[PDB]
Design a binder for this molecule. Sequence first.
Ligand code: BCL
Ligand code: BCL
Ligand SMILES: CC[C@H]1c2cc3[nH]c4c(c3C)C(=O)[C@H](C(=O)OC)c4c3nc(cc4[nH]c(cc(n2)[C@@H]1C)c(C(C)=O)c4C)[C@@H](C)[C@@H]3CCC(=O)OC/C=C(\C)CCC[C@@H](C)CCC[C@H](C)CCCC(C)C
Ligand SMILES: CC[C@H]1c2cc3[nH]c4c(c3C)C(=O)[C@H](C(=O)OC)c4c3nc(cc4[nH]c(cc(n2)[C@@H]1C)c(C(C)=O)c4C)[C@@H](C)[C@@H]3CCC(=O)OC/C=C(\C)CCC[C@H](C)CCC[C@H](C)CCCC(C)C
Ligand SMILES: [Fe+3]
Lengths: 237, 266, 296
Amino acid sequence: LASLAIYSFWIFLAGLIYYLQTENMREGYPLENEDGTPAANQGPFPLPKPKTFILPHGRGTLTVPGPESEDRPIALARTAVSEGFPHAPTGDPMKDGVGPASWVARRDLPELDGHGHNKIKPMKAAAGFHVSAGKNPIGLPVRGCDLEIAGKVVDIWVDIPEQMARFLEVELKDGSTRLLPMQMVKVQSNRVHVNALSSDLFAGIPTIKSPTEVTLLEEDKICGYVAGGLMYAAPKR
Amino acid sequence: FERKYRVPGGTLVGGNLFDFWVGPFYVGFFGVATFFFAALGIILIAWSAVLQGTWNPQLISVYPPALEYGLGGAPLAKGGLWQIITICATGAFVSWALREVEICRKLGIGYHIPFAFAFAILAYLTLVLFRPVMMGAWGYAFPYGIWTHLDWVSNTGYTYGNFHYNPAHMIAISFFFTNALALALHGALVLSAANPEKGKEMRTPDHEDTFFRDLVGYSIGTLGIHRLGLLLSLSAVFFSALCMIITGTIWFDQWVDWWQWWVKLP
Amino acid sequence: IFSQVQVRGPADLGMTEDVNLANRSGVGPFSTLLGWFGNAQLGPIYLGSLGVLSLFSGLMWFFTIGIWFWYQAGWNPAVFLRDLFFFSLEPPAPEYGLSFAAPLKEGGLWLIASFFMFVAVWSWWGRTYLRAQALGMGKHTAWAFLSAIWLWMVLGFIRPILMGSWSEAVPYGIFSHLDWTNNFSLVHGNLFYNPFHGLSIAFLYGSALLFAMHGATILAVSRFGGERELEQIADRGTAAERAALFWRWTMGFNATMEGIHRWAIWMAVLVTLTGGIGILLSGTVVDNWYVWGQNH
Ligand code: BCL
Ligand code: BCL
Ligand SMILES: CC[C@H]1c2cc3[nH]c4c(c3C)C(=O)[C@H](C(=O)OC)c4c3nc(cc4[nH]c(cc(n2)[C@@H]1C)c(C(C)=O)c4C)[C@@H](C)[C@@H]3CCC(=O)OC/C=C(\C)CCC[C@@H](C)CCC[C@H](C)CCCC(C)C
Ligand SMILES: CC[C@H]1c2cc3[nH]c4c(c3C)C(=O)[C@H](C(=O)OC)c4c3nc(cc4[nH]c(cc(n2)[C@@H]1C)c(C(C)=O)c4C)[C@@H](C)[C@@H]3CCC(=O)OC/C=C(\C)CCC[C@H](C)CCC[C@H](C)CCCC(C)C
Ligand SMILES: [Fe+3]
């Protein structure tokens, strides 16, 4: 026994690392990477078996060995010689949503909580929801990556089931509103700021289709664009 | 996906000069740096291998300066080669961390992994630099070999009797356990959810939070249990680091004799 | 990173699916503290027949040891409290056998305290599968709990059964459990040479590796709504796209948002699964791991 047990354990570990596990990591990844050779170095089990998630609420199915690709297009030219190099931004990349500002075309639908509909709703609409500790962001002047005050927090958009401040609706001086993600703003006792996006190009945040409901795609566009202020807002070194 | 992400990165050091991927690997100035320190240490260990006469891993072991050497000297064969391999350890780790910082700065992602790694490096640097210098001699450090380090552990442990009695070490053990329980549980919940009962639709976060309320009367946050992870693991390792730097410097006796402090009066 | 502002609403509830028993303490909120980190809402709990079975038996176990503890300090609490850490309750231990009929102090005391220990834990396992199937989720936490149960079963029931002596089990007491553990090393020729204990340390270490990574990666990608995990599993966006690239471009590969939880559970379960086999062999087949070792 004993040596037999550890020997067979090593067998099982091998049989649990690649097989089943690295296998399951391929499920929704590049299912084989091209723009070069489709594996190029050693072989995995060429992707795992199909599996399909049944979606609730609306309904749907997702056959998770995901044979998708993007043509939503990538405004990204080449630096050529190393087949494997930087891809040059051909056009204002924050607008283009390339690199640190990439979005993904997740469904254009809001994420519905457990019962149904809209996890993130603004606090105007939130069924008896309001601030339990810490300074209330509302009415605080959002600043810049500079002195320059970009707008005013007019509302907090709240994730109802988890009870949390996801976004801050900011009525930019224009009368137009857009959503700064909480995890990208430092709420202070007198300013409040996304010292992560210029001021200069706050305006370009992807606008909301229905002013009370965020959609996964919309959401992903806002978070992605905001992130690119770090690096691309040439202050932010 | 990915292609979209291969933008002319936010490289800390190396400007445009080192912004490129060999295969998957991002390289970056700190990537070549991680390679340079790795090679310098692999060659160097192979030299202490050939010099002790074995090319077998259960046997090759690199040892510190003997307790007379204080804090410096040592000929390569008699401590020196540990020292310079330690240099390449601290140099290769710190370079890999900073390689993570550059991969974050490119990626629009924010710093938490580097920072969490910094804690692993600290546990290491406590044993290899701080407690040694603190105690005045590199010989209190540990042998770089697959089996001789465990046995180093049995000696320093048993020098103060049963090391279970080291209080910060008790805490350390406690977090490691809670952290492991927590990992099992966290992984298990997102999987009982993402793959529901056989022939049923996916469960919402709400179902998870409900299961933990029904099971233990609370459910921490979904972003919360991921903050809790970083906390349990980095604290486990912090308390581990403190219990060792404490040991050789303020508690020289058999650890069980600490607890008598509570026992008296009667 | 902790909450900036905290936002409350009405008491949340969700399903529970079986009989509404899930009401005990429908309130709690701990804004003061918990909300800065995790969720402010304490409660409700589902106390059902099994719940009650476990809590009754858990308190019974605890209190059995409790009254047996008091005896050792007579009655005086000033004393009891200093010697709380040093008190114990050894098996029979009084060393001889699994002979059942043994005195309260020499057997009985431990056997009756261990009878409850057994039932609190076992009912709880049952409970965790029920609450799993009720909400339509099924077994996963209960799959993982059984390895914790394996190591627990090994050290108190199964190995003593195999060595014909209840004296083989871990004694109830805070410092006793630290010393049984030390002596176990010793009489088996230093547990570092036991290839399963070295593998359990690989997984225990591995688990604080993996959570320190998993965790930190969601907290770096919370920015893109990363923490939502299940939605990214049912619909990938930048958060699961970006986390993948971080690890791929760092160490050469990465893991799908659902799949890293398949890494996570397995790394944790193999700490007690491995360990349990480890101690099941120690002493029953291998008495000195050094020697076993030297045959390698
Ligand atoms: C000096 C003593 C020996 C030694 C003796 C032992 C012994 C003896 C054992 C271990 C075991 C382990 N040792 Mg060792 N070990 C040594 C040195 C080390 C060193 C080191 C020096 O670096 C390390 C890192 C370790 C690490 C480890 C772990 C990997 C492993 C414990 C698994 C675990 O976490 O499960 C912890 C999980 C549990 C204990 C199960 C929990 C079960 C559930 C059901 C609890 C329910 C609780 C409920 C009823 C309520 C309780 C109320 C209370 C008030 C809390 N050992 C030295 C050399 N080690 C264990 C093992 O399995 O071996 C591999 C083991 O049995
Ligand atoms: C027999 C001796 C004594 C004893 C003596 C000691 C001693 C002595 C020490 C410990 C330490 C520890 N002991 Mg003990 N301990 C005993 C019994 C136990 C028991 C038990 C089961 O009862 C337990 C649970 C523990 C538990 C623990 C841990 C809390 C702690 C390990 C710290 C750590 O993980 O940091 C680990 C972190 C590191 C070492 C950093 C390394 C990582 C970095 C990132 C570098 C690695 C990069 C790599 C080289 C790159 C390779 C690349 C390749 C491609 C792979 N001990 C017995 C009683 N214990 C240690 C401690 O407190 O920590 C300082 C310690 O020094
Ligand atoms: C609280 C922090 C916890 C943690 C976190 C953590 N580890 C991390 C990260 C994080 C967040 C990474 O980003 C980084 C990583 O790349 O992840 C895979 C990493 C990492 N943690 C690792 C290991 C590791 N972490 C450990 C611990 C921990 N890591 C903590 C539990 C341990 C333990 C338990 O001892 C180990 C073994 C690596 C797998 C990985 C990358 C480390 C790295 O920088 O490697 C690149 C360096 C080289 C390849 C050059 C090494 C060349 C020479 C100098 C040889 C060194 C020899 C050595 C000094 C002696 C060997 C002796 C032993 C055999 C006894
Ligand atoms: C992969 C193995 C890891 C693991 C996993 C694990 N543990 C688990 C599960 C899993 C997967 C569960 O599903 C189950 C759970 O319910 O999750 C919380 C559980 C669990 N792991 C637990 C403990 C535990 N696990 C441990 C370890 C581990 N568990 C491993 C790290 C340890 C160690 C030794 O460190 C402990 C102490 C329990 C909390 C929990 C359920 C066990 C159980 O069935 O308990 C029933 C107990 C009673 C009925 C007793 C009632 C109360 C006591 C009498 C007194 C409490 C005294 C305390 C001093 C007071 C605190 C008061 C208040 C502030 C609450
Ligand atoms: Fe997760």
